[PDB]
Amino acid sequence: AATQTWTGDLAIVTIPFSSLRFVKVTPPFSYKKRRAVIETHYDQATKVLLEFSRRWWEFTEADWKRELDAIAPGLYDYYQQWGEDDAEAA
Amino acid sequence: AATQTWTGDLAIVTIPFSSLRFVKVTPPFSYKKRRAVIETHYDQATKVLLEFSRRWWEFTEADWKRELDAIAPGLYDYYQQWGEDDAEAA
Amino acid sequence: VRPATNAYGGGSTTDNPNRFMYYPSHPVPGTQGGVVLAAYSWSDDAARWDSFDDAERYGYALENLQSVHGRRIEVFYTGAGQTQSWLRDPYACGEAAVYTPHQMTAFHLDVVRPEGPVYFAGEHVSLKHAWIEGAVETAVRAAIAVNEAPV
Amino acid sequence: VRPATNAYGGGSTTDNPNRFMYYPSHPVPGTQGGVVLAAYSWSDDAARWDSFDDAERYGYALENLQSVHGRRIEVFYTGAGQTQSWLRDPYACGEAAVYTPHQMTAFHLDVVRPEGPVYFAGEHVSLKHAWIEGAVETAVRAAIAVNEAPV
Amino acid sequence: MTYEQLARELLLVGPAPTNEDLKLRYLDVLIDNGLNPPGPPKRILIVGAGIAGLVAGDLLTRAGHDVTILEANANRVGGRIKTFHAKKGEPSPFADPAQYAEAGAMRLPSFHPLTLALIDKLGLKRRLFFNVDIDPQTGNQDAPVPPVFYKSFKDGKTWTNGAPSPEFKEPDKRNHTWIRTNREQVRRAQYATDPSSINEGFHLTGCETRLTVSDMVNQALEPVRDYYSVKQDDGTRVNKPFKEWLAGWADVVRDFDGYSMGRFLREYAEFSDEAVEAIGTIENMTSRLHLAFFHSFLGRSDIDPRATYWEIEGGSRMLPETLAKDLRDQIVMGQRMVRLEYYDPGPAVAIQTVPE
Amino acid sequence: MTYEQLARELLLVGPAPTNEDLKLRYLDVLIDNGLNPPGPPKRILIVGAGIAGLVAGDLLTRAGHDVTILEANANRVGGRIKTFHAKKGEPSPFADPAQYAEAGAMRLPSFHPLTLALIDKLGLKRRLFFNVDIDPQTGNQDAPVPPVFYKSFKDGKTWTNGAPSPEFKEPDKRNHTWIRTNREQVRRAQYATDPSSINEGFHLTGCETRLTVSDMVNQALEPVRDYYSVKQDDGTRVNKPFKEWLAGWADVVRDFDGYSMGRFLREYAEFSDEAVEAIGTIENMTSRLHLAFFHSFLGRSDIDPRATYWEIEGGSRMLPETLAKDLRDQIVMGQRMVRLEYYDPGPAVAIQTVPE
Ligand SMILES: Cc1cc2nc3c(=O)[nH]c(=O)nc-3n(C[C@H](O)[C@H](O)[C@H](O)COP(=O)(O)OP(=O)(O)OC[C@H]3O[C@@H](n4cnc5c(N)ncnc54)[C@H](O)[C@@H]3O)c2cc1C
């Protein structure tokens, strides 16, 4: 159905004002209520999640060489030679 | 090519700091230069563009009925009957 | 029924989410139509449309446009629209730099300072942000320093 | 070569774009791995990743993660990641309401006020923004008013 | 009079006569009884199946009312409470199908009674969320979880979920996690004993250098905490006697609401740009810096220094999805409110929605 | 001393001895001669093919240097200067293949010499951009476009693109456009003569009601304009004598940089919340309201009340794309800088890029 209307006697609007900003309303809410809807600033936030085969952050140094050399022959030392890049985005 | 390195004696960085924020750098720029790159706020803006068969905004009332009735029989009055919704997103 | 706008150029202001609408200063020669900047807004006003993706936006845009010019305009709408969000652009990562209070005195002089052989230019290095003049102005300034720079 | 982190739970802070990284408080039982909140940031810090689309983000995220824990971690990276941008969500249109100075005294009392038969609730109607407690707290309050409301 | 009114709202205090403690009433209606006298059963339109909606829609349904919960999302309720997890019938978010993480809400404060108790009432297991890395060989978490506990500003009244569990004790926290700023990297334990190192990285000179950013912030807040509470010789604080504890906060609203958190640290606390830089960096107040002082001040993680955080087993989703099992008939998915017409003297409501 | 330094940067004034007018030097190097003495020809890395990059990369190439312009975009230069137009080989942005619109920059101020002249030098036609709706049956735009003109704060010096065109005259502006706020809608001409109507819509009471939001703002800025300039009996302004015109602005930097535009209208100009609401709404300062006072103040469209705006025929793209025809060999598309290594005593630069 292109549309669908609901009706009742009371209504509880629980959507964020940022979303309510796009709803057509009538009659107009109280002047201040409108301003609050036009002006309430919604902050932005982003989460990035990465998956790991193991819980390396728990590792000790032994755990590292241990756990690491297990995946492949002399893999531990391979990274010791490599070291850490000196370029940061900081 | 996965990558590609360039070299010279001087360099002019013209990308916005928001983009430079993700570049790995070395050695570190001066402390303040970094902060400015971490802290310079880039404002957001969005433009939405709609295309119209005619330049209606130029129209006069006559132009409207004239131009409008041209598209189809009695189309002008059809919209006069319809009127304007009372719901705004304001 | 909203009165005939009958306006040439310029644009209108509103509190509906479209905020500012601009009309073409000159008509493309040989054409019978035109494109209007149905919606253009900065900061939070803009943060709004940023929630919606490119394709969805056209809907509201037309509705909020009708709220000011009349439902009637819908006839001439070709059904073609374009939308440009600058925060969503991985190359602009925003419209322009715009300082929050105190930032300029906090570190703007350090913004211009070159770092070793690295020089900076562009809209934000100037003090005419969100303007091309700032861009160009600092571009030249940059070329002047590197040009006469001891090789 | 970055030292072994050897940390259980908690998270670390950095000025690289990842900003804050959190480690799982408890490991999913029966598993050998785990997922880490590689990058989580608000406002402008967040505005950054907002420039990039879902899929691209994982790259940097891993790099900035390595800058603090070592390049070594890359071995355990499954190559699977998930990213949630709240400004880009057409249902949240942002993380949460967060007042700019003066807004609260300017109109927060009007925020709570019901409009005719319309009542408002949710995180933003409270004063514990960006918290569930605010949400719930105002939900109940809402049900109390409509419940005993003269039909 | 608007200031006092705000303090009320902030504090959850009823009208002047009684000055009821609303946290009690809400705990009552949501945990204990429910909506006491189920008033004139009416038709109710609830937009949004986020936590707010699900809770009201549940209390109201349980009290006999014709509740309809319109939700724009077509496959998920919970709103800003989302959790990545394998969904019966499609690819799992992560390689390991048993893994899951939070896309939104992830931790629940001890001083958040309603939610804590709510989670319990719904029969949900809640584990300890480690806000600071911990020593996994300490504390006993296998003991039954301590119950929710609340204390009102009203003459020694409280509220609890049930019987204590003195067997339960939170693990001790090591600060073996990192702080890497300005190319320098140290552990939190170290930064704690000696902030000099990384503070100098932000160019903090002199006195400021010998303090952690936290304390620097706490030090800066005391004068304000003074509006409503009073310093304690033992090094603690107790709110002043109601009348003042109210007028104080109302004063805080009059004096610092026009301050961005930064303009406050700067101009009021007379902190240096470098101090604000280190502060905003080590404890996310850099991005917020220009947002209201209040949003940062209320959050102030002080109050309960021994408080605790929690997380729902199985994911944050568990909370909203459980409330949803009940409202199986009220909730309507894939419906976005686009129009809202209501009648106001000086059917009562019509809401039009589009399919998603 | 940092304040004065800022005023310099703001004003484009050289060092204390001479106090050179940099707008002249830039006009010189970009329009007249070019980089005067082509110093030690060196290898140059320019990141970004936006207007900034294209201009520097062009001046430098023209002065004999090995210039390489690395651009992340794979199909477009111009950066924040984009224009929707049919691209030989694919679908046109609009149904009518001949239509085009701005996705970014769209108008050029008369008081922006460099860009205006630059557009001319490149042999680009520039039409009048109507910032306010106009009466299409007035003014003569068919006359040759007036030339760019600049006036320096330095004792009667100037700069022009060429010979005047007193035949050219901008159309008269009608304000037949709309202002629709709080469900009310009026024309700009009306709001001008009587702001009462729509101001009351924002609940402006008393005195404030009888003024347009603009004037309300101008009225509010005078005291500041006073730092650097002086009111004129005829109702105009002339900057004070250099020494003060510099120290004034430096003072403006010391006094209002810590002000958000809102906290200024509010606390300093002592405007009411309703006044700020109407103001922020009628002339976009609602969303910016919490951003630096300076960003809003500099923009201040005053100065040249008779100034004019312009637009490039064919699109804004014309400007960057023309500069690009030259640097055909310097510009490298689809290359994103991801790493930047440079050598600093106390090859000089290496930039690594990824393919896009
Ligand atoms: C919606 C909008 C409207 C505007 N309206 C006007 C107006 O009417 N008048 C006016 O004068 N100005 C206006 N402006 C501002 C003006 O366009 C800018 O100030 C100016 O173009 C900025 O030039 P720039 O060279 O500094 O940067 P940009 O044009 O942003 O160019 C930077 C370039 O670097 C590239 N890049 C970025 N990161 C990397 C990387 N890591 N590696 C390689 N390449 C990279 C980008 O792709 C881009 O081409 C507007 C801007 C916007 C967003």
Ligand SMILES: Cc1cc2nc3c(=O)[nH]c(=O)nc-3n(C[C@H](O)[C@H](O)[C@H](O)COP(=O)(O)OP(=O)(O)OC[C@H]3O[C@@H](n4cnc5c(N)ncnc54)[C@H](O)[C@@H]3O)c2cc1C
């Ligand atoms: C990244 C992030 C991390 C967080 N971390 C925490 C934390 O650790 N602890 C904590 O307590 N809180 C946290 N929160 C905040 C908490 O999740 C929110 O305060 C709370 O869930 C808000 O509930 P709500 O019911 O008010 O709104 P929402 O949950 O946003 O729900 C509103 C609902 O309305 C729907 N909707 C919107 N518009 C329409 C429309 N037009 N028509 C129909 N339906 C519509 C939406 O789809 C949604 O389901 C976090 C939030 C974010 C974004």
